[PDB]
Short mmCIF file of C-alpha atoms in Angstrom, two decimals:
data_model
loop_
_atom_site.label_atom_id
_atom_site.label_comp_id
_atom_site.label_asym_id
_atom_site.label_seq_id
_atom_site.Cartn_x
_atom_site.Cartn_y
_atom_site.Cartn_z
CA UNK A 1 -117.60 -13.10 104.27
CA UNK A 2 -115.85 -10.27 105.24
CA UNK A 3 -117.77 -9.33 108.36
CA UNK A 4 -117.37 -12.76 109.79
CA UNK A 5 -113.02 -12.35 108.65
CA UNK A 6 -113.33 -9.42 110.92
CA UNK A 7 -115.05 -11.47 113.80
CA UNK A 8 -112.42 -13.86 113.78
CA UNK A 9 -109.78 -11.34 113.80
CA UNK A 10 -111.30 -10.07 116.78
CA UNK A 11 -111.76 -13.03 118.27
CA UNK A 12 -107.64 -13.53 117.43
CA UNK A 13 -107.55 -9.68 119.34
CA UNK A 14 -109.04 -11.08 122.45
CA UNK A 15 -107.11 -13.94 122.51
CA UNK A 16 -103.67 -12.01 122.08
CA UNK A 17 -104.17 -9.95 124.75
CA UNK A 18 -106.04 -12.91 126.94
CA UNK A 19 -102.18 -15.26 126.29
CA UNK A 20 -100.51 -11.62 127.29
CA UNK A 21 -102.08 -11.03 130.51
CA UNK A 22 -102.72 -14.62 131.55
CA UNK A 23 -99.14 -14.95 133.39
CA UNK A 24 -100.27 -11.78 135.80
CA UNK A 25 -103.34 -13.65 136.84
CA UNK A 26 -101.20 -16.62 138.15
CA UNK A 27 -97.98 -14.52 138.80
CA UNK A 28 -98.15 -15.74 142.55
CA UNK A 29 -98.02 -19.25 141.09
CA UNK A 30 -95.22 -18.98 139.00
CA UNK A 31 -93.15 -16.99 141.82
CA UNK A 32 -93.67 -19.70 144.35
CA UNK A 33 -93.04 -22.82 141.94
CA UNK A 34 -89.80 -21.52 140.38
CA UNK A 35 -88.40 -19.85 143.81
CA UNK A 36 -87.75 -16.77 142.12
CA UNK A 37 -88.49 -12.82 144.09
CA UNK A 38 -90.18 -9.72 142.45
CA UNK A 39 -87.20 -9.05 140.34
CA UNK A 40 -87.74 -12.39 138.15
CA UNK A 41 -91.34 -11.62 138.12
CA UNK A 42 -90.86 -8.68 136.84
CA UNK A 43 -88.49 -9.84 134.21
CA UNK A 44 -91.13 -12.20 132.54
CA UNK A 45 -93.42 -8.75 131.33
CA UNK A 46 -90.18 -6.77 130.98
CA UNK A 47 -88.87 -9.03 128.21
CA UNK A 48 -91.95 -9.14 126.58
CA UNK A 49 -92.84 -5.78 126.36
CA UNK A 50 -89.11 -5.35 125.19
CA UNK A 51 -89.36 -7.85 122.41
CA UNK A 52 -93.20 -6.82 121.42
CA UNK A 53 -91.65 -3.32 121.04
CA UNK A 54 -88.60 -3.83 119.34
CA UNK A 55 -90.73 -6.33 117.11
CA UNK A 56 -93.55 -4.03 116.00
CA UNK A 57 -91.46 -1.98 113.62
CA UNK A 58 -89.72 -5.07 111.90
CA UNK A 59 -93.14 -6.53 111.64
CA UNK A 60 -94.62 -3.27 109.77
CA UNK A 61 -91.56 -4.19 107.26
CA UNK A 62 -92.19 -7.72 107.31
CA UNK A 63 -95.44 -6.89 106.86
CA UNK A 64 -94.60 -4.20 103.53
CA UNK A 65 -91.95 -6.86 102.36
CA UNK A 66 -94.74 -10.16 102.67
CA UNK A 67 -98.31 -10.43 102.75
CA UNK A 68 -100.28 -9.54 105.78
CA UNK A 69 -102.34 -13.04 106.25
CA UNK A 70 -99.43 -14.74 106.50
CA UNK A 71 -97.80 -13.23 108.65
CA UNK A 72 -100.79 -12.85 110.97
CA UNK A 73 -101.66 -16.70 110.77
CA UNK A 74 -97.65 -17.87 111.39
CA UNK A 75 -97.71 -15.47 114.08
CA UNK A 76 -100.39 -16.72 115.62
CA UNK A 77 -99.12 -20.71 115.34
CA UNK A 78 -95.94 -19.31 116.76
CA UNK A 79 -97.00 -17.76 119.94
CA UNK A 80 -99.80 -20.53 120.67
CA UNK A 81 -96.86 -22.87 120.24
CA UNK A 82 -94.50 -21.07 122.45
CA UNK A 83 -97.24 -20.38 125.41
CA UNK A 84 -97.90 -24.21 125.22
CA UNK A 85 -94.39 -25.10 124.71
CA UNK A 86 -93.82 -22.37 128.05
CA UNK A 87 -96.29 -24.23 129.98
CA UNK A 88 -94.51 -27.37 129.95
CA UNK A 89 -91.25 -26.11 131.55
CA UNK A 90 -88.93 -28.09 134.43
CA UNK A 91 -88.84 -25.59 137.98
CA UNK A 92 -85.15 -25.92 137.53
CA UNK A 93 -84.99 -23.57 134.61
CA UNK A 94 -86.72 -20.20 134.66
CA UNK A 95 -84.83 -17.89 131.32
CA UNK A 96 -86.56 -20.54 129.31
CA UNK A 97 -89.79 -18.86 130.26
CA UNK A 98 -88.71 -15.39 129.41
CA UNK A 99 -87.77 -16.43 126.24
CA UNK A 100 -90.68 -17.99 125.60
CA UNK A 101 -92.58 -14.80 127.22
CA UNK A 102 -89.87 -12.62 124.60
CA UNK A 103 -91.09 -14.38 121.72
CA UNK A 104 -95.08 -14.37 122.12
CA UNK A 105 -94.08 -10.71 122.45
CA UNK A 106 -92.93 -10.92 119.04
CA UNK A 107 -95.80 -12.45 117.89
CA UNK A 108 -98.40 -10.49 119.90
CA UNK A 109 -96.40 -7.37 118.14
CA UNK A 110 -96.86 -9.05 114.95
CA UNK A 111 -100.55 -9.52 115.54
CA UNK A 112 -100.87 -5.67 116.74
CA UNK A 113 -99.53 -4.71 113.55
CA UNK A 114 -100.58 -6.52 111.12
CA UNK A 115 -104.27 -6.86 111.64
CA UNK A 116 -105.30 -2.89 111.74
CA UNK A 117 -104.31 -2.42 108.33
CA UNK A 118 -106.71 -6.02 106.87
CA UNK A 119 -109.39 -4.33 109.01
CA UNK A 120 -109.05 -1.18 107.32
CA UNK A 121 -108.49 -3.04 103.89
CA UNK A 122 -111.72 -5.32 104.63
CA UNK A 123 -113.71 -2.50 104.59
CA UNK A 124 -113.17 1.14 103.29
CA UNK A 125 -117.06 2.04 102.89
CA UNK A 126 -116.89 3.89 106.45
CA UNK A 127 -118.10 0.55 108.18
CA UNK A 128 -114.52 0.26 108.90
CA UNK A 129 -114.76 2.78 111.74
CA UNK A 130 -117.18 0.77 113.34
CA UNK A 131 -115.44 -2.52 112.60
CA UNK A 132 -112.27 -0.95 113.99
CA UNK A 133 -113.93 0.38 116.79
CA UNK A 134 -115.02 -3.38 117.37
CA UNK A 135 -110.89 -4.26 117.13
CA UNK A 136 -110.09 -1.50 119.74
CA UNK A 137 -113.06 -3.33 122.14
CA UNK A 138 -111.63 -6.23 121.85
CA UNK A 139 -108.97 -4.87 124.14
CA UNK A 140 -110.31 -4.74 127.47
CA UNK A 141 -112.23 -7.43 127.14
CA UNK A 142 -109.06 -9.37 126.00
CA UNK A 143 -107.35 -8.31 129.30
CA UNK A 144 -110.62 -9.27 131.44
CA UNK A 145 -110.65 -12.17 130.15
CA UNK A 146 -106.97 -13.09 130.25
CA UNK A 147 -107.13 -12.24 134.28
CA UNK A 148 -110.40 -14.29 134.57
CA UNK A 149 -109.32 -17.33 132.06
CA UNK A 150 -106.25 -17.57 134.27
CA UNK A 151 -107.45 -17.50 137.60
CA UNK A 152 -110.26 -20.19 137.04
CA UNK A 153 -108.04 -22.46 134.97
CA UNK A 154 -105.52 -22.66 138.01
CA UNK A 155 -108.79 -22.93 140.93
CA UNK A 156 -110.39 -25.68 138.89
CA UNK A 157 -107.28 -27.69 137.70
CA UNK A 158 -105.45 -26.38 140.84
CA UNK A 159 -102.06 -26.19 138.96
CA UNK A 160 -100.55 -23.19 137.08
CA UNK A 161 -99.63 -24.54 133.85
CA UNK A 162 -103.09 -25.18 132.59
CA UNK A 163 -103.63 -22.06 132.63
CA UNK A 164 -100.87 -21.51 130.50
CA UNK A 165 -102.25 -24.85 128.26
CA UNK A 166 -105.80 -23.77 127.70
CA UNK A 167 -104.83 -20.69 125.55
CA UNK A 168 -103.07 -22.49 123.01
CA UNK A 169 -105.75 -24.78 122.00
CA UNK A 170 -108.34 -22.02 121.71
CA UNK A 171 -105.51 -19.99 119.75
CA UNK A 172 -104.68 -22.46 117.70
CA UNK A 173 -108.18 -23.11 116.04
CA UNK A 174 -108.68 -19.41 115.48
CA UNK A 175 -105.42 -19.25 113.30
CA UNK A 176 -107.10 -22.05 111.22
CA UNK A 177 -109.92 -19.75 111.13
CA UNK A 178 -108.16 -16.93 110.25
CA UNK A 179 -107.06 -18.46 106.84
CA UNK A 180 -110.63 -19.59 106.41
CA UNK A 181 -112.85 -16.82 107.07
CA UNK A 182 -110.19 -13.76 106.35
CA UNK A 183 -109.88 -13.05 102.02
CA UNK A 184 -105.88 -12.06 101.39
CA UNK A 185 -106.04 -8.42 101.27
CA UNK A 186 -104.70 -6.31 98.33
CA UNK A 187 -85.10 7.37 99.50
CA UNK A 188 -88.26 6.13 102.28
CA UNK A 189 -85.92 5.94 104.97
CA UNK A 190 -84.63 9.38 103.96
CA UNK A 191 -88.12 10.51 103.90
CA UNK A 192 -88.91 9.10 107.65
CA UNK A 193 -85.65 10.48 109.08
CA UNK A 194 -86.64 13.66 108.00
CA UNK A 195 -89.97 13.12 109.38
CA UNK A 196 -88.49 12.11 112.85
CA UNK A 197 -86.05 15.23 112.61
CA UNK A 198 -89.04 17.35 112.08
CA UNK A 199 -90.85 15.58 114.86
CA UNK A 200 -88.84 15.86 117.64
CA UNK A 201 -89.33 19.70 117.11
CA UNK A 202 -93.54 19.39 117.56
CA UNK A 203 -94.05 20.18 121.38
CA UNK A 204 -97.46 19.06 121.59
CA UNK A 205 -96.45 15.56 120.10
CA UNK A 206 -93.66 15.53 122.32
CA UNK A 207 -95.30 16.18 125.26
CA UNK A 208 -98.45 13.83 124.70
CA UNK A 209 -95.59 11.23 123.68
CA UNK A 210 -94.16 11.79 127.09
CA UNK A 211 -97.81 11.60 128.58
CA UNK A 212 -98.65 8.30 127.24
CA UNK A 213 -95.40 6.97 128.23
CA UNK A 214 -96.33 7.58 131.62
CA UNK A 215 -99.74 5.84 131.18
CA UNK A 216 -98.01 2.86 129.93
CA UNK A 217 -95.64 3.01 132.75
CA UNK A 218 -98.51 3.21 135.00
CA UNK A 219 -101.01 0.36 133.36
CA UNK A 220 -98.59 -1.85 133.12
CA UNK A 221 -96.77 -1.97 136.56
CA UNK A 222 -100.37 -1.67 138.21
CA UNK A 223 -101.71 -4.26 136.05
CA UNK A 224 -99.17 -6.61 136.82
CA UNK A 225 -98.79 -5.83 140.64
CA UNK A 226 -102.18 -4.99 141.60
CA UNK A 227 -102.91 -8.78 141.93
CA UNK A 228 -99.88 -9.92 144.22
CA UNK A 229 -100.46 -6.86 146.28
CA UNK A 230 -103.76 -8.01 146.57
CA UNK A 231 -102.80 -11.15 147.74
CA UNK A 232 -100.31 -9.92 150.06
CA UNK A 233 -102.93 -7.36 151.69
CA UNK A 234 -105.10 -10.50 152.61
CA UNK A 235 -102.00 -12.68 153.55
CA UNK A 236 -101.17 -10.19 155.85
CA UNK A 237 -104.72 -9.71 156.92
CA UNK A 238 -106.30 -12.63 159.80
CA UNK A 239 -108.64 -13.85 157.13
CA UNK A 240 -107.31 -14.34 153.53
CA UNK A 241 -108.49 -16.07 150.38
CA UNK A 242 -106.16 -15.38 145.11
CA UNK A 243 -108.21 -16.71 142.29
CA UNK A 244 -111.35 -14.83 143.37
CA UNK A 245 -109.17 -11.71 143.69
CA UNK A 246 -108.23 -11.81 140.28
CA UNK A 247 -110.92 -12.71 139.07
CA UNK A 248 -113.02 -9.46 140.82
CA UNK A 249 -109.42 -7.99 139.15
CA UNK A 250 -110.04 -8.64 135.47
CA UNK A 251 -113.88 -8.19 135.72
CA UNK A 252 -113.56 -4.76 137.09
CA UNK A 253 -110.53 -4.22 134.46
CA UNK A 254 -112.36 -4.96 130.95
CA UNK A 255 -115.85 -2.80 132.84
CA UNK A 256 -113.58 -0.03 133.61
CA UNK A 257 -111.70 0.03 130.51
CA UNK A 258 -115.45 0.04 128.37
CA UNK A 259 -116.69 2.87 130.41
CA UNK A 260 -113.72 4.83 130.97
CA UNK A 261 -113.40 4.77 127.34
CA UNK A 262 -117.08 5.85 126.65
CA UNK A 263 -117.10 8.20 129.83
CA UNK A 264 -113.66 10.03 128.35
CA UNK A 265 -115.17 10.71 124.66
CA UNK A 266 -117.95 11.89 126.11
CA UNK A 267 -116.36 14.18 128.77
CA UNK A 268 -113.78 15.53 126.04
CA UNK A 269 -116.65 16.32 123.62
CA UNK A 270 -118.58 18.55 126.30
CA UNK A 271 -115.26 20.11 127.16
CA UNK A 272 -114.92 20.88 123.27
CA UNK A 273 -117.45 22.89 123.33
CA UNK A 274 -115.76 25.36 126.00
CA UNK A 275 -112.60 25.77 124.95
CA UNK A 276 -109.90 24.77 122.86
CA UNK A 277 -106.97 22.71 124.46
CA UNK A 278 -110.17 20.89 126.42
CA UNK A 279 -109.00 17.64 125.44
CA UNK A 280 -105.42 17.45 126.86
CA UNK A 281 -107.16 19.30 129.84
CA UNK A 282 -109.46 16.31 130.72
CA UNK A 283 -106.68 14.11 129.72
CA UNK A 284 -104.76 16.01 132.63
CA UNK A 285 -107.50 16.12 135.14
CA UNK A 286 -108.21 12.42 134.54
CA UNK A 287 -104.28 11.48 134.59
CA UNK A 288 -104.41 13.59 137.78
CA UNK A 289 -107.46 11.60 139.04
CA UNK A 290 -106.26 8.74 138.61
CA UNK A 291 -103.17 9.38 140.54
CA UNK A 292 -105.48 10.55 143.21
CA UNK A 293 -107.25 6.85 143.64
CA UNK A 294 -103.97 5.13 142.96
CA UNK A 295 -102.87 6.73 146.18
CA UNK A 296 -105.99 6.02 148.09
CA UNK A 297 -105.44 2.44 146.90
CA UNK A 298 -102.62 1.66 149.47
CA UNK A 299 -104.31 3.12 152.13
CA UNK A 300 -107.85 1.84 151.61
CA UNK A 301 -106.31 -2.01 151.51
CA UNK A 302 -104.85 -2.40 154.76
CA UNK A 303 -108.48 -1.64 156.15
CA UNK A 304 -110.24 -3.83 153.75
CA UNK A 305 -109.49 -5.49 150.12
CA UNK A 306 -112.97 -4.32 149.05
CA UNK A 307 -112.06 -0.40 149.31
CA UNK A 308 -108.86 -1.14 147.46
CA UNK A 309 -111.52 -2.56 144.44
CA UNK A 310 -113.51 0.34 144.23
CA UNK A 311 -110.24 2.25 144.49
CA UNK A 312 -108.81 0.16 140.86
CA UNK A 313 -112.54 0.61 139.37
CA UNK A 314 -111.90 4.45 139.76
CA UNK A 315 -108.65 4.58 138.65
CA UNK A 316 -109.05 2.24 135.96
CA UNK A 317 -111.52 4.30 134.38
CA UNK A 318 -109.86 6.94 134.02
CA UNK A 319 -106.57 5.89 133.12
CA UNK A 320 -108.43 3.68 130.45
CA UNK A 321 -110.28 6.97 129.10
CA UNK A 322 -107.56 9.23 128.66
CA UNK A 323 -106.36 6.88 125.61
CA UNK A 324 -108.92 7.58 123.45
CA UNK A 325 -108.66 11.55 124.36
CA UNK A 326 -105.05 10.96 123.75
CA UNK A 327 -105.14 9.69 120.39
CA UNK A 328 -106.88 12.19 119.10
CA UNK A 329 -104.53 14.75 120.76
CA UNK A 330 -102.17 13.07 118.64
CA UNK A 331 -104.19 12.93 115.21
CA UNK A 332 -104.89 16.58 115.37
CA UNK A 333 -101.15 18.03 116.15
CA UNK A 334 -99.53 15.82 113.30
CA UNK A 335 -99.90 16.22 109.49
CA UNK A 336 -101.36 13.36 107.35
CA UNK A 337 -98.40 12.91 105.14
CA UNK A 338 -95.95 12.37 108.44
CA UNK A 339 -98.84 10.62 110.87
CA UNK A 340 -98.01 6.78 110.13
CA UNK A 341 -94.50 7.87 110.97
CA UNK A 342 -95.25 9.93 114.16
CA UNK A 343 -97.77 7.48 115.29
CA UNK A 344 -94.88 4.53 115.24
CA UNK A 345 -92.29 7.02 117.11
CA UNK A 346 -95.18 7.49 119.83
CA UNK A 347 -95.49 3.81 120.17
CA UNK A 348 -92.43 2.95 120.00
CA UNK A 349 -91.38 5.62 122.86
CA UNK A 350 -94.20 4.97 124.91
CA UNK A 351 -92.96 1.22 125.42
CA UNK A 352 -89.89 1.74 125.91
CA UNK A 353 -90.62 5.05 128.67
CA UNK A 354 -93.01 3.19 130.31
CA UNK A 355 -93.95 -0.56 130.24
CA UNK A 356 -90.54 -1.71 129.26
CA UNK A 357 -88.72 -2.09 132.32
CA UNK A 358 -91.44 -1.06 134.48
CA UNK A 359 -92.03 -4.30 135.87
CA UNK A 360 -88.71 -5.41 136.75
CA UNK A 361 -87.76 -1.58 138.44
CA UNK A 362 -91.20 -2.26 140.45
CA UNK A 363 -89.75 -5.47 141.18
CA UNK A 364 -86.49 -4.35 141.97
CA UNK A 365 -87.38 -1.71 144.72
CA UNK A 366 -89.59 -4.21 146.70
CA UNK A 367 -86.36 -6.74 146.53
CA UNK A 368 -83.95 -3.59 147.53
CA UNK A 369 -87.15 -2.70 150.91
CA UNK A 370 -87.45 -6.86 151.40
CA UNK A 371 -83.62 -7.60 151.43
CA UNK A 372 -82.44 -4.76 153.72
CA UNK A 373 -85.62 -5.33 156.06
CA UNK A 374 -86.29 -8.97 157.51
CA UNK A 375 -88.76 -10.93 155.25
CA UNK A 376 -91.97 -11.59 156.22
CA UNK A 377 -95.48 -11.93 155.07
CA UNK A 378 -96.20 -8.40 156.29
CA UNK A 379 -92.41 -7.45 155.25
CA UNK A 380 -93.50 -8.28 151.45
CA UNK A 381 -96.47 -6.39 151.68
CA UNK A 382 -95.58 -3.40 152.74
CA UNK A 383 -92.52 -3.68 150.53
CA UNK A 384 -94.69 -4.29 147.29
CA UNK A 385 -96.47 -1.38 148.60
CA UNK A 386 -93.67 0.65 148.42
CA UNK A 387 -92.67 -0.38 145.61
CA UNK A 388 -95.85 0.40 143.64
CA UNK A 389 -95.90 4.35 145.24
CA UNK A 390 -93.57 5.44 142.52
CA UNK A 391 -96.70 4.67 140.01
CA UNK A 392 -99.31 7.70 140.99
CA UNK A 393 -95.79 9.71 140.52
CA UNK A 394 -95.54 8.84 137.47
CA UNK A 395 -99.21 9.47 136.89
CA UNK A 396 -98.90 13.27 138.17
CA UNK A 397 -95.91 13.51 135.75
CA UNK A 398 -97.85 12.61 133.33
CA UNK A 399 -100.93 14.87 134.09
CA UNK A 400 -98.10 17.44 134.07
CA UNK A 401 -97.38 16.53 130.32
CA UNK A 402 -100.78 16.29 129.92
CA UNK A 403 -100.94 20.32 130.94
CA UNK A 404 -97.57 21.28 128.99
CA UNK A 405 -99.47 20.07 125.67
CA UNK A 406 -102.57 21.82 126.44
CA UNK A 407 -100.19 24.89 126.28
CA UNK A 408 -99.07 24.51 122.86
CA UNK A 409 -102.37 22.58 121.46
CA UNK A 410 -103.72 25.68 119.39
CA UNK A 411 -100.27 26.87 117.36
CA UNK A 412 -99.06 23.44 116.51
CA UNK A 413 -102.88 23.06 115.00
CA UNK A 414 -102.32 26.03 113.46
CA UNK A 415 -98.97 25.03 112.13
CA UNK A 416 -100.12 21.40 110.88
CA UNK A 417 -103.00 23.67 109.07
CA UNK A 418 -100.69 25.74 107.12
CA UNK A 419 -98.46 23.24 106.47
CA UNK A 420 -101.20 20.82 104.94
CA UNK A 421 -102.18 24.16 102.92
CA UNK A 422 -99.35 23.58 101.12
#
């Protein structure tokens, strides 16, 4: 009963995030068959992280003005629909795709927001930590698997829009399910404007806010570039392959994600014991880590493609744990009354900083380096390199926020602690 509603709605988890990152996996496709540069690559995520954004707050009132089922299930029909609907698109038109990328965004943000709170309904007996826990798996594996699905699709059928086909029909069924399996579950504006104007005065918040825009900025533009740079590398190269890149990609992507996530609780709960502050600490040395390997990246791929993997495994992991570390930075500096509305402002902000744009500014530089340089197969490379420098940056700027809440971790406690007193 309800154990198998939650197994489809993680099921309908994995295969969100497996329709969001299937266009990365066959990105190189999609650039050569609609003659479009990095820029309108970049555009395609860009617009849908925009939309999924700007979506998820509507969808929280959608979702407090209409049931959550229904939402969830329409949503689902309506981005299946869409990514099919995307796959069959002429070459002479490309904004039809990023509206049909903007609007699975809205439906992906839909999903994201609607199905935590019938997983938490489901169950309220303290299985629900484990059942969320499941939900939050679901999300490396959904990436994995989008990166994997895609790549195979387009080497077997040999053409791009399957991959953009198969999705749809798999989604589709699992909405059906999700009716099925899934039992319906069962002066505020004032009060979260005052809750934002008391917000913006938490430093701690603020500056893991700032953090884990920087670690969206990061995932996302890596994500989404690591496999054309990959591709380039080898094009460059004497010997070259792209689907067995991406698929090494996504299968070191959901492994990484699994144990950066279990190697970053653990770490953070030996550091507890220390001191306090220890977790935005290891979220700074990982953040800091990370940037490390996501420098060594560039020059580990010229010599071989293989270093460059190891290089994403490492980095990957620990720019996967520091969520979890993150999240519970969060949980501890804000007050349970104003959580639900600090959490939103931190997601909210953290798409728009980073992840919302990202791809099209990464984009955009390696059009700027290509267009005032001759183009070339080694041109684009080293120009996509380029490009993607500005990430571990971003991930040191990050580590830095990382550091600036350690700072203020134990007073804001202390503050949320006095103020829940009362």
């Amino acid at each position: 009963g309800r154990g198998a509603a939650a197994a489809i709605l993680s099921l309908g988890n994995v295969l969100n995030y497996l329709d969001r990152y299937t266009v990365a996996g066959v990105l190189l496709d999609i650039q050569q068959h609609f003659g479009v540069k990095d820029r309108g690559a970049g555009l395609l995520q860009s617009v849908f992280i925009c939309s999924f954004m700007v979506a998820a707050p509507i969808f929280g009132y959608l979702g407090d003005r209409f049931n959550r089922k229904v939402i969830l299930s329409c949503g689902i029909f309506f981005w299946s629909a869409v990514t099919f609907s995307s796959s069959f698109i002429p070459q002479q038109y490309f904004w039809l795709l990023v509206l049909s990328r903007g609007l699975v965004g809205i439906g992906e943000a839909s999903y994201s927001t609607i199905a935590p709170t019938i997983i938490g309904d489901l169950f309220t007996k303290n299985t629900r930590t484990l059942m969320l826990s499941v939900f939050y798996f679901a999300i490396p594996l959904g990436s994995g698997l989008g990166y994997i699905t895609g790549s195979s699709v387009k080497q077997a059928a040999g053409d791009w829009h399957w991959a953009l086909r198969v999705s749809p029909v798999l989604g589709m069924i699992t909405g059906t399910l999700i009716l099925i399996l899934v039992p319906a579950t069962k002066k505020a504006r004032t009060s979260w404007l005052r809750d934002m104007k008391a917000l913006i005065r938490n430093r701690s918040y603020v500056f893991s806010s700032l953090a884990t825009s920087a670690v969206s900025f990061a995932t996302g533009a890596l994500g989404m570039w690591i496999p054309l740079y990959l591709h380039r590398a080898q094009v460059v190269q004497k010997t070259a392959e792209g689907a067995k890149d991406s698929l090494i990609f996504g299968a070191i992507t959901c492994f990484t994600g699994f144990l950066g996530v279990v190697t970053g609780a653990g770490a953070t709960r030996w550091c507890r014991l220390k001191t306090q502050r220890a977790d935005p600490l290891v979220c700074a040395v990982g953040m800091l880590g990370s940037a490390i390997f996501i420098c060594l990246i560039f020059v580990a791929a010229k010599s071989s493609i293989v270093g460059a993997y190891i290089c994403i495994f490492v980095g990957e992991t620990l720019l996967f744990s520091n969520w979890a570390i993150t999240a519970d930075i969060l949980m501890y500096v804000v007050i349970p009354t104003r959580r639900a509305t600090a959490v939103a402002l931190q997601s909210f902000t953290s798409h728009l900083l980073g992840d919302a744009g990202s791809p099209y500014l990464i984009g955009f530089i390696s059009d700027l380096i290509r267009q005032s340089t001759k183009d070339s197969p080694l041109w684009e490379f080293l120009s996509l390199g380029y490009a993607l420098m500005l990430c571990p940056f971003v991930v040191v700027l990050g580590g830095m926020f990382f550091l600036a809440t350690a700072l203020f971790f134990v007073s804001d406690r202390a503050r949320a602690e006095q103020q829940v007193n009362q």
